[PDB]
């Protein structure tokens, strides 16, 4: 009985980061052929990329005659952009009282009398 | 020629989404026992969370009210120092 020679080096477990490739052989008119029927090596072994996404733009708003709005990047070391995201636009508001400054700009006066 | 008992499964190589593992054994009294001498199964097919960082609020800006915003930036992942959020951009223009 005798081994066949080895077929391709077939799928890597892994995009990056480090996986293992297999390539298999057959014994040919025995159970039993010295050694193993398979072989495993090392494969994209590139560790993987900085993937980004960038939040929409916040809506535009007043500088003070100028307007202004903003967005940031998500990144993310991944193999697959898919499991990179951006979640929900998230806004709070706070009450300037009817002088409009007061605890937003301002805090409270103080007077001494 | 003999193999032994197999080992126990080496560390898996990935905690979350899928890695790989072996396990070994020895051909006592020379090389050429039939067979292998390594195995490989899968492990932690648990999927990876999804991790999320929030980003920094915008300034406050003027809507009587003022208003700010934020995101959040998640990512399928096994370590969260592996998702990081970028500086914040301003797009100005003359206006309103
Ligand atoms: C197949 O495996 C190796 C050859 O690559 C030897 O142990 C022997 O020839 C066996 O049949
Ligand atoms: C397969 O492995 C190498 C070729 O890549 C050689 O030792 C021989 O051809 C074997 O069958
Ligand atoms: C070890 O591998 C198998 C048993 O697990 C057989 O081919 C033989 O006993 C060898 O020594
Ligand atoms: C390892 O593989 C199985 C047990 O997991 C048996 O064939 C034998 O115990 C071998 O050493």
Redesign the pocket.
Known sequence: MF????GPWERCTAQCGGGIQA?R?ICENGPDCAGCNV?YQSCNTNPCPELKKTTPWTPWTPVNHYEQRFRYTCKARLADPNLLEVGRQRIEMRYCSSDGTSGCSTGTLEVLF
Do not use: D, H, Q, V
């Open positions: 081994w066949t020679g080895w390539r052989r072989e």
